[PDB]
Amino acid sequence: ANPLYQKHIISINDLSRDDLNLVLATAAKLKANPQPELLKHKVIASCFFAASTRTRLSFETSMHRLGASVVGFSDSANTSLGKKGETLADTISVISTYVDAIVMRHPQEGAARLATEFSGNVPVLNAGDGSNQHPTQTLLDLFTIQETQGRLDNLHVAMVGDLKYGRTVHSLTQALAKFDGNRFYFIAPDALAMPQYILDMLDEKGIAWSLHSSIEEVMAEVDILYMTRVQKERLDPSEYANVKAQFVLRASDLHNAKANMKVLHPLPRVDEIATDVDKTPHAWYFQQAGNGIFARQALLALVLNRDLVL
Amino acid sequence: ANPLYQKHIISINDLSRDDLNLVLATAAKLKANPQPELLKHKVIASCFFAASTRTRLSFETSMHRLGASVVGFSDSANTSLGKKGETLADTISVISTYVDAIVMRHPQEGAARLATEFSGNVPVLNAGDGSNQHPTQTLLDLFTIQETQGRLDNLHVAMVGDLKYGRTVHSLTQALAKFDGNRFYFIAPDALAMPQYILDMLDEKGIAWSLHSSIEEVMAEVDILYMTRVQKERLDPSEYANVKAQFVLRASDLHNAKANMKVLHPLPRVDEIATDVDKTPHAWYFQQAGNGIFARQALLALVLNRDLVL
Amino acid sequence: ANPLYQKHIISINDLSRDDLNLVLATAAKLKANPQPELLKHKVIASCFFAASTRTRLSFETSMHRLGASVVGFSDSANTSLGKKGETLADTISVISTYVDAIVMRHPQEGAARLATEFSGNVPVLNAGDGSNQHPTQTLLDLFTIQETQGRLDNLHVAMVGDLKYGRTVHSLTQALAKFDGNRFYFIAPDALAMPQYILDMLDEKGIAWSLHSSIEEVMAEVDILYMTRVQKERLDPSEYANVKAQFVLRASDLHNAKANMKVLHPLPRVDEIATDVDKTPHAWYFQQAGNGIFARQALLALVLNRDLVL
Amino acid sequence: ANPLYQKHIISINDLSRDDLNLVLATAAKLKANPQPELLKHKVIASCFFAASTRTRLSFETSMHRLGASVVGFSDSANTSLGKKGETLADTISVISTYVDAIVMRHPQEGAARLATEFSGNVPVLNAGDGSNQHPTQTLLDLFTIQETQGRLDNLHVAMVGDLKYGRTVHSLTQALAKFDGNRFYFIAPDALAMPQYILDMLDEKGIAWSLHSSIEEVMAEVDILYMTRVQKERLDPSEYANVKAQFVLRASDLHNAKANMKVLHPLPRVDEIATDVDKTPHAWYFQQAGNGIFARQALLALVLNRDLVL
Amino acid sequence: MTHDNKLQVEAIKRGTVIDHIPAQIGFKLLSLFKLTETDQRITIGLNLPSGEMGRKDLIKIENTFLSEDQVDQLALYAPQATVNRIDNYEVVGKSRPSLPERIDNVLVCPNSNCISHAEPVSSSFAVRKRANDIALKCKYCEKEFSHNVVLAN
Amino acid sequence: MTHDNKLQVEAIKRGTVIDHIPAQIGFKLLSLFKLTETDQRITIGLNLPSGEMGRKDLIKIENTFLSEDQVDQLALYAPQATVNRIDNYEVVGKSRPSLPERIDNVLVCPNSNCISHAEPVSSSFAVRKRANDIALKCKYCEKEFSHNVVLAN
Ligand SMILES: Nc1ccn([C@@H]2O[C@H](COP(=O)(O)OP(=O)(O)OP(=O)(O)O)[C@@H](O)[C@H]2O)c(=O)n1
Ligand SMILES: Nc1ccn([C@@H]2O[C@H](COP(=O)(O)OP(=O)(O)OP(=O)(O)O)[C@@H](O)[C@H]2O)c(=O)n1
């Protein structure tokens, strides 16, 4: 069997370099030679206990691109007093009796891990468990970096924006720390700094990082420029606009950018990347979104399919 | 043709012993030898005018397990003033022009019966019409009793909890009254008693029943122990807790339970069955849930498929 | 000096037949010889954490009629002291430094009583605490009863509707069980019978009581007919419509009633009292409401004035 | 003649140490020798376009205590002058032809000040304008501080919690920086430190200040301990629970505090002050609340009376 | 009947000895009435060979005496128990738990709509024996329950 | 100093003796590790003196032995307790708690949005030491706290 067969994908920290490479090689293969009846007669639950339509739409499209039926629910709705209802444990045990795998997004951290304690032999894929993990976001990110850059080690990766609450930068950095010779540049405002605990991880594995007050400092050196939505609710509307201007990317800031440089952004963008940046070849955030279709088919294929004959 | 072909499944009272056995034999057959392209090119509407995700998720999974496409809606939403909208009659007539069968849950009793007056030759399956019927719940229940017990007659069936508003116990008892030699034990609180009209039915067919103040009285005698959610809103939070303790099932109450004894529970459970009861072999409520996948495929297959060659 | 001066009013059981008569007397005095500047310069708070428009207005008018000013709020759907985060204790701790008295309604039982431990000098009056007490309603009812029948002793009092959940009928029974020679007739649906503890307490006092299928049954034996709205939500709309033929009252039922007999209702009424009753001499539910002003002024006066000069 | 007669109260910075003391003095006079008919025949409006139950009641009681009548509203979730279509300008333009003074709370900063340009003769008082001013809160705090410590000069004042977003602590600091010899201790999470501009302003005055990890640290150097609720929504529930061990206060922390020291809190409190503090002689947050009545009467009197005779 | 089969035996000179606790009730009383929160010396015997037949718990608290009302608190979990007020190594007084007036903070109101749950109040139940049925009435919501019901916390 | 002649603490044939429990932890261990949930003879002395090394607690559990894990499970409360197994009135072995790898069923994650605050799950924490404290990573939360904070109160 493949190593991922019948496994639960809950956190990025539970995946090894190898596991990572395997998923990515596969995604590559499926992107080039599709397999639209691979997951024929399989039924997968799409349980969005917490709404997230881009994530969902992406997952479900992958499901159908591989031949699987989908059933599920996007939820937000009349659960406000669903606490006087049954447990998540009981919800999983019922569903695990119907479907062949479970994709789920949920408001509380640890939710997907608990799920796996009750799904029996049904594999659980985390599409998001509160402020904790989002492993398939990180995997479409790596895939995109590797497909545009050519490797995952020896990169100059600049991470920009809200680095404190930005769950996918934390995740991506943790993933990239598994490869070699990478160099990190953090360009956040001081209130939204890369948490200590990440810096400590890096220092321990002896990985080079640096703080810059601006992009332009490091623009000429970076390969991958990873932007993040500054949540404004996370701020004071005053404090926001006082520094906003400092960490907004406009087309004209790339003039000195290396030819290979890619601008990534996980999620919905606003004022952090100006529209003019879109007309340039460094802009790769929509492409990055279409790549989640192959990062996600790779997962589904590997977990549900004992042996893959790509 | 099979006898169920092109029929509307609205109430349990419209089904005969035979009809019941046929559905159950089929469910058995499909459970053992699946037919995933049986309902190929058929389209079925999943009209949940009233939300019920477990019921829906179950139905839809069955649809896809048999090869059918699904379209539909779970509803709750902006119908609060949908009364200044069209009738249910008109909604059915439009939909009956698109789809090959109609599964529907609805807030008002009689809703599914009215539907059948306007669906033309499109069969209508009731997934719930207010406080009236839920025939596929009763059918997965029988299936589970028969598959674990070995028969549907000569059983000691104990029904516990809220017996007054518990629509599926009323339905199950009505179904079981069609078989022979069954013995009923009702263990409800006096405010939530088995309604008179049911007792009268039983007395008339000369079927043995008994009221017990507790489980332990009859534990050694029962084959099937059917529990029901006590709705607390149905009570006074005081009155609730005053008797709650009397009709809550804990693992340690089964010590004297027969080897064949199964604990069933239709729906979401809370405090009525303790979690420790789950680790025992009498616990069969999750199993009972997975059996609705075969009770429901049996229906769909029989109604839409003139001749079944299992 | 007055026995109720600066006393809290929470529960009817904390009042004596003496305290009761005291209130009713003052009430009668204030009804005849108004004191519109009795409570000048005092500030009362009207804390409806649960809204009750009928009760609220009664009180505030009572308040204004004696010349007090009023501060307060209505309906705490998410008001920061009830439902955000603040304790009730702290709310009262705070408002008790602002006002001379507090009137509160609250969704939890015992809430007024709790208040009492945080209100220091400041008397608190209960305008309802969940399903528990509603002293002002009862004082309203007694006053009326005695104003129309001339005594609170030796009455043939019939109570109808929901005697199981009618928090008003329970209290009324308690209060009237403090006088001698009253005889009760309890007409109600079995699903709604008078609680046992009430029946018990009646019997350890030796008060004649009995239960009755319907109102025609005792129509000519009764001085007071006290109707309560039947909560239909409290039962099955089929179940409900079956019984309500024996519990609505119409003028035609009245053909045989005593001339002294009066029909009371705490209001609001839905269809338990037909409108044709409204024009008979027996109809006394809007006058009953009217007497809520005097019953309430009497209380406010007693509590905030060391002695009455009327 | 009084310096504040028919003046607007919007921001603390528009008040002098002179105007401040004036208010505190009158406040102290009114606390001792009440004038319950001072503002007779005047009509004040209480325009809570943002609801704040604690503040609202304070004011209205203050209003009634001086004998004014009150008109107003609370919580403009979609009230036609705030949020439908009407400008605030036009609202004030209109209400300024009805009343003798206006008290308003509003979700936008600068809203009270705008009003001021449309209110003509009619003074407007700020009861909060977004994150900006809350003069009445501060006057409440000073008055208390000075009533318990006997001076507003040379104090060892510690402030705790959210000094970054605590609009109250900022204002309190400004106000107290108008007296001489005060020394501040700022205990707070780094994510919430006292803004720089405040620190700056302190320094261009030469007021001794410093920052502190925790309250035990300075416990015995302080006259006043001013706690502010930490907004947990303002941070990660993991992140939040990590720091809050160093910022809640318990009576045990108090073992070493000065006898003069008092704990203040603008309220509402959640778990930053344990209830066991409530019974120590230092606990002064409910009294603080109580003094809001006098601070507020003082202001209303000053603004609407040409001169005080007390 | 000081556990004396051998030697080195448990005694004490001054304090309280609460004997004849039903087996397994012993711990609960240490929990519930918080008897260990003391710098004093305590000795405890769980599952001890009861006076005649069976096991019983026992607790000895040095130079600590308790009130008739304390003693009485215990009547709901160890009514048979006996409290001993020994001084100078001698048992000068023997009290037995008799049904109290009220039971403050130890009981939980079975009513979930009672205000007591959400708030910084101490619980209080009024105690009333219904001929072996003993009914507890909650001070706030004023509902009344059988002690069997309220003793599920 | 488990020497103390004077009418106290006796020896046992078999079982386990947990000595040198710092004071006010003895009850914490009783509580947390559900040790009274047994019908074997249990002797607890609380606030006995460790000679002069403060006041220690002490727990004797007849006919009962533990595992290295169960002993390691005590390393957080009583990192300096000693566990003496006994067979036939003599101490055939001693042990100290060694701080474990993971920690199941007794802690509580500080994080209020951790799903292990609703559901039928026992908590598990990975344990790892730092300069001046121990970090605990929640199984579900996946978040990590100083043991001092996870020791919420
Ligand atoms: N200075 C003392 C005296 C007595 N004991 C304890 O005190 C309890 C009561 O002993 P005592 O009442 O004098 O004789 P008992 O025969 O046990 O009384 P009973 O009917 O209660 O058995 C005994 O369990 C004994 O262990 C003690 O520890 N310290
Ligand atoms: N059958 C036995 C064996 C031992 N002990 C207890 O088990 C422990 C044995 O430790 P010990 O050998 O006596 O050394 P101690 O002198 O206190 O020194 P240490 O403090 O190092 O553990 C003592 O607490 C003793 O009370 C007992 O009561 N019954």
Ligand SMILES: [Zn+2]
């Ligand atoms: Zn209660």
